[PDB]
Design a binder for this molecule. Sequence first.
Ligand code: HEM
Ligand SMILES: [Cl-]
Length: 439
Amino acid sequence: FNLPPGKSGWPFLGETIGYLKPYTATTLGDFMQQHVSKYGKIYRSNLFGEPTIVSADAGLNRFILQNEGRLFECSYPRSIGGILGKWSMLVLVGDMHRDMRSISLNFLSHARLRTILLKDVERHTLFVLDSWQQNSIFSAQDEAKKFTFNLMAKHIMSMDPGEEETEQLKKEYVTFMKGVVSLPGTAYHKALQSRATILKFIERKMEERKLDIKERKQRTDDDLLGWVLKHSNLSTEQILDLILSLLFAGHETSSVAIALAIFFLQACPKAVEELREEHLEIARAKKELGESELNWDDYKKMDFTQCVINETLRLGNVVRFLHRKALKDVRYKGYDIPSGWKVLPVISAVHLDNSRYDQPNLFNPWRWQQQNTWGNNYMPFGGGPRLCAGSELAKLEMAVFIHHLVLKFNWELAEDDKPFAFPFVDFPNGLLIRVSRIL
Ligand code: HEM
Ligand SMILES: [Cl-]
């Protein structure tokens, strides 16, 4: 019987404060690097109020991910467990989760991806990028968040950008997100108030949709709200939790990824040159054909863009680790994971590994003309039965945004900045950039 080595830290809190200490997002951070150096890639700790096995071992992390529902299961801390609702897909397990995942996969199907969703992705890209003024200075992080929130609101509830009900859902949504990152104080009871308001807003739009469906109007299931009403048997409270958890799942991730790409690309002008060549050829082809909107076949031509995307996610690491629990005693590589203990697969660790990538701290999208996303080396979307249901939409959002960005603008940092993990990734100075339109 061999328990992994490590400390236990302070009572109640353990090593949580040190574990959560902000660190530059392109690294693992002092706490993680030092613990791996002293104890190895598998070590024990006391985190988020529970005894914990931390894993920076890519072989163990894929074993955990693939054995969801058998040896391990998703398990958030008590505080974080319930802010997205009892029926949040990110927290559910068992049959209910299997049913909610099947719904998300079907709504995000390839057929719907290449017709419905792509049109909205390009429309929302141009809604943002056409408002950018010459020689202006602004926060790219805020613009990225604008793009992805607008886009998600369209996808889930057919809301249009810039309209009042959408700008007000943003303020309510961010006030609610100030609860996840937290006495409770007046900034936690405020987040529960906002959550209730949001749930009442979603239930309002749900009743309007049930009327559209009863009156047999066409294309009622273009958004997620209409889709679950027509194609599922979820209850009202289940629908509200699904809508809210999808907004979070799709916006918090995609916004960071877009911002990371803007950041990495201004420091890699040769990658922007190759992107312009690839995207100018696509645009020239459509001009000769007299076609205006992008189609799936144009997206399939964005080979080097997919290299930038993979490199952005490998180096930037939108998600630092996952929250899991062991369902029974497990033995792996000679260590014992006791039942009921928390298990944290640090899926970001292998992305920064010297032995799996050559110069992992360098942004080098050309490495993906040799490497591949299959296997242990690459898991920014997770793995196993909970592998990210929106990954294909995420890549499409980045590709379409990049396409119009490099065709319309040059950009530079107006103020020094760097990404940090809190563990959520964010730019402290807001990623201010100056832009100028091309010829
Ligand atoms: C760069 C963008 C994204 C990244 C890095 C990312 C990452 C992840 C990861 C690591 C998980 C696994 C959670 C776990 O195993 O506990 C996950 C789950 C999920 N993601 Fe994403 N995601 C991204 C974009 C999106 C988008 C755009 C959507 C939807 C519009 C989405 C929807 C979901 C859903 C529904 C799940 C739950 C899957 C399940 O429980 O079976 N994601 N994501
Ligand atoms: Cl490499």
